Amino acid sequence: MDGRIKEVSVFTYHKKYNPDKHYIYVVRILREGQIEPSFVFRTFDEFQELHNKLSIIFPLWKLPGFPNRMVLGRTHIKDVAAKRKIELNSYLQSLMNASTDVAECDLVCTFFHGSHH
């Protein structure tokens, strides 16, 4: 409801068969200046990279918990994708309900800009 991004969510995900490749998460953004949402496409690693970058500049007490994992292979198969849809959504809600200095910072703004980018 905040500064210009008003709503974010992990809308859906897809990909990766005969286990080898990777999932991409579809993120829906609604901004104060638009009527229709925008959509961007982000991997788990991109989310983890965002958290790792924010950790550089912010003490961890200011950030959400990050739902950390991500090997390569051997897993809970890919109920992991389904699980990450929820956990990455909760991360995003927490991030946008953070202190303004975090929720409206350049790292966060950048993450949400650009379909792929």
From Swiss-Prot:
Top-level taxon of origin: Eukaryota
Record function comment: Generates phosphatidylinositol 3-phosphate (PtdIns3P) and phosphatidylinositol 3,4-bisphosphate (PtdIns(3,4)P2) that act as second messengers. Has a role in several intracellular trafficking events. Functions in insulin signaling and secretion. Required for translocation of the glucose transporter SLC2A4/GLUT4 to the plasma membrane and glucose uptake in response to insulin-mediated RHOQ activation.
Family note: Belongs to the PI3/PI4-kinase family.
Domain PX: 3-113
Description of post-translational modifications: Phosphorylated upon insulin stimulation; which may lead to enzyme activation.
UniProt source species: Homo sapiens
Subcellular location: Cell membrane; Cytoplasmic vesicle, Clathrin-coated vesicle; Nucleus; Cytoplasm
Gene of this entry: PIK3C2A
Protein name (database record): Phosphatidylinositol 4-phosphate 3-kinase C2 domain-containing subunit alpha
Subunit structure: Part of a complex with ERBB2 and EGFR. Interacts with clathrin trimers. Interacts with SBF2/MTMR13.
Expression tissues: Expressed in columnar and transitional epithelia, mononuclear cells, smooth muscle cells, and endothelial cells lining capillaries and small venules (at protein level). Ubiquitously expressed, with highest levels in heart, placenta and ovary, and lowest levels in the kidney. Detected at low levels in islets of Langerhans from type 2 diabetes mellitus individuals.
Disease linkage: Oculoskeletodental syndrome: An autosomal recessive syndrome characterized by congenital cataracts, short stature, dysmorphic features with coarse facies, dental anomalies, multiple skeletal abnormalities, and neurological manifestations. Other recurrent features include hearing loss, secondary glaucoma, and nephrocalcinosis.
Region Interaction with PtdIns(4,5)P2-containing membranes, annotated ranges: 69-74
